[PDB]
Design an enzyme around this catalytic site. Structure first.
Site, PDB file in Angstrom:
ATOM      1  CG  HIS A 157      -7.312  11.452   5.570  1.00 55.87           C
ATOM      2  ND1 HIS A 157      -6.375  10.401   5.580  1.00 55.87           N
ATOM      3  CD2 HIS A 157      -6.652  12.706   6.061  1.00 55.87           C
ATOM      4  CE1 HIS A 157      -5.103  10.828   5.841  1.00 55.87           C
ATOM      5  NE2 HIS A 157      -5.376  12.280   6.427  1.00 55.87           N
ATOM      6  N   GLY A 201     -10.066  -8.800   2.460  1.00 51.20           N
ATOM      7  CA  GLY A 201     -10.433  -8.274   1.170  1.00 51.20           C
ATOM      8  C   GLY A 201     -10.658  -6.762   0.992  1.00 51.20           C
ATOM      9  CG  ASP A 217      -6.664  -3.936   5.471  1.00 50.64           C
ATOM     10  OD1 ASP A 217      -6.648  -3.459   4.258  1.00 50.64           O
ATOM     11  OD2 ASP A 217      -5.548  -4.062   5.952  1.00 50.64           O
TER      12      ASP A 217
END
Ligand code: HG
Ligand code: HG
Lengths: 299, 299
Positions: free
Chosen positions: B205, B185, B159
């Protein structure tokens, strides 16, 4: 259980918006006779098709519609109210959702910081009466019915033109050729009539609170006393409060707290409002249970 | 009868606003121990007093409060949810009523034209597994619990920082000293891991629709095949539709149709979404009735 209620209460924007935007391209009207798939639907709309699907669902959830078989959808007898027929309860949603209402209510918290025609009035009974004077009549709705009703009684009106002053063919149309006695101007002017009974229809409904006091100052500063001041209104539950029904009063109080003026006084909030503004209580009498319509009557 | 429902549906702005603006100067908190009259109330607020009364009523009507005796008021166990305790279902209302949400939804029609941590995942069972790779983990919530759970399994994350990347003392804190294997990343980058199982939590979501397709293009263009791609999600009732419960899915679809991105795919809308994006169905398994939480799992 309880959360269910709270969310359902807190998620009112969703519920509110979805219905307006369904009638906005009158979906129901397509399904009154019948219409199926999102594809046949989406042709006669514009918009998206697989992001319009995400709305049909929402409607069907809110129970206004109901998909009977995969994809393809019908509508419910609640969704019947949204076509423009018998009730036509969709004008309602359209005005309560356009920026005029919906965007106005957005910042309403700050304000917290800062064709009806009673034959009900033929239960008051003008049955020994000669003269009347409808204060701020305008349309000639009651005036007609009441001077139509009692062939010997006569009457007067005073409203400024450009305030539904289409009396022209309504006091005239339907029998009351004599007994128009019409005047003009605001209610803020000291009213020159001193002639028997005085009538004010759903009018605090229009007013503020001490606007009501001074428009009733303008009556008894030259009312002919020993006669009757009628005022027909929606009240507010001094009965007790409750949930079911009632409603209309509560969220029209706040509606008019945003959309123009109107606030709702109870019984005693009229009694004191009159006792200082030169009027003396007498009897009060409502409509049946379905409404809050109340014929007040102080001497 | 029916009108009652329609109005109640159409008048959602009222219902929605009143609750937010009650907790806005946390009224409930005054009445948790006890508080009476509008006068004692109005001291610790600001605002009006006889135009704050016109709100207490509205609350009491919406059943969040209840005036027991003339004027003076208490609150209900629904109104208990609004203090900042156990549930604290008032942050909910505060964000769903400020201009960020409430003013945004005002013009949402146009868009129609245009700390969770599954131990549920310890019913999938990693019970013959050595490696895993949590795609876009961020917080280190599952990663922890799962590599905590199975002492021999090891794992990876990727992340960008400034996207709840406080892993520092969470993969570390609570046992998983080894088996961080952390990378950095976006998910738009072609993912260098080819190591056993792949995990994506409540992530469509977050996504759009063909955003989902290409972030899953970025997996199988260099996934080590013959292993399992897990993705845990909220689904949408392909079961049927219904009214009670469900709800959350429907008006979070539209919430994220306004407030950032998110849309809700059903079962088959994941099956085809995977079949073209290089993934192969296998089993699906939900949470119990209270939720829609679904552990999808295609090979
Ligand atoms: Hg309006
Ligand atoms: Hg929001």
């Amino acid at each position: 259980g309880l959360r269910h209620r709270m969310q359902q209460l807190i998620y009112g924007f969703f519920t509110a918006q979805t219905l307006h935007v369904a009638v906005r391209l009158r979906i129901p009207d397509l399904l009154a006779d019948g219409a199926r798939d999102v594809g046949d639907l989406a042709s006669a709309t514009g918009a998206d098709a697989p992001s319009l699907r995400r709305l049909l669902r929402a409607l069907v959830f809110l129970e206004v519609l109901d998909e009977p078989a995969p994809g393809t959808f019908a509508l419910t007898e609640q969704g019947e109210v949204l076509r423009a027929d018998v009730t036509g309860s969709m004008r309602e949603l359209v005005l309560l959702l356009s920026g005029p209402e919906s965007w106005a209510a957005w910042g309403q918290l700050e304000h917290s910081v800062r064709a009806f025609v009673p034959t009900l009035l033929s239960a008051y009974d003008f049955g020994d009466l000669r003269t009347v004077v409808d204060v701020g009549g305008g349309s000639g709705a009651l005036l007609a019915g009441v001077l139509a009703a009692h062939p010997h009684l006569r009457g007067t009106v005073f409203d400024t033109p450009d305030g539904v002053a289409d009396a022209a063919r309504t006091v005239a149309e339907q029998g009351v050729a004599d007994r128009c006695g019409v005047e003009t101007g605001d209610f803020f002017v000291s009213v020159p009539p001193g002639a028997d009974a005085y009538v004010l229809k759903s009018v605090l409904h229009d007013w503020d609170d001490e606007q009501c006091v001074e428009v009733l100052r303008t009556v008894r500063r030259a009312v002919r006393p020993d006669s009757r001041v009628i005022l027909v209104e929606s009240l507010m539950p001094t009965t007790v409060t409750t949930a079911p029904s009632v409603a209309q009063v509560v969220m029209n109080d706040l509606n008019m707290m945003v959309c123009h003026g109107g606030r709702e006084r109870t019984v005693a909030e009229f009694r004191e409002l009159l006792r200082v503004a030169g009027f003396r209580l007498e009897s009060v009498t409502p409509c049946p249970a379905p409404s809050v319509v109340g014929i007040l009557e102080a001497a």
